[PDB]
Design a protein around this nucleic acid. Sequence first.
RNA 1: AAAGUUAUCCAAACUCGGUCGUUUAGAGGAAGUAAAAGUCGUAACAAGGUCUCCGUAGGUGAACCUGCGGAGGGAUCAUUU
Length: 45
Amino acid sequence: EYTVPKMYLKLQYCVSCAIHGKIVRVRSREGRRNRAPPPRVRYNK
RNA sequence: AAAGUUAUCCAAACUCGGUCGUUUAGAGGAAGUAAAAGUCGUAACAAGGUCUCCGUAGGUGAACCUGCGGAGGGAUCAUUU
Ligand SMILES: [Mg+2]
Ligand SMILES: [Mg+2]
Ligand SMILES: [Mg+2]
Ligand SMILES: [Mg+2]
Ligand SMILES: [Mg+2]
């Protein structure tokens, strides 16, 4: 039995390249002030 | 005791030079405002199609472009061992 190793990276972007690669996107005026991380899907349908 | 006369003082006026202020002529050079049915491009306002702007330095017909350090008045108030 073998376990393939992992790889660890830390990418970091300017804002101009952040929303062209769809890392983040425009939010509404009221929804802007919400800094909780998005809830990742834990059921996947 | 009059004309006249000697030496100081108070001094108008003229001549030459210096200095300050106002007004005015000038070949040529370089800007601003307005008036246009002008010529050549399209820098900015939408991610204005290379995100925009600030200080500094260089370059190009013209708007402008590029290097170094900033700012968000941005196109992100946000990504977990
Ligand atoms: Mg003159
Ligand atoms: Mg003249
Ligand atoms: Mg431009
Ligand atoms: Mg802009
Ligand atoms: Mg704005």
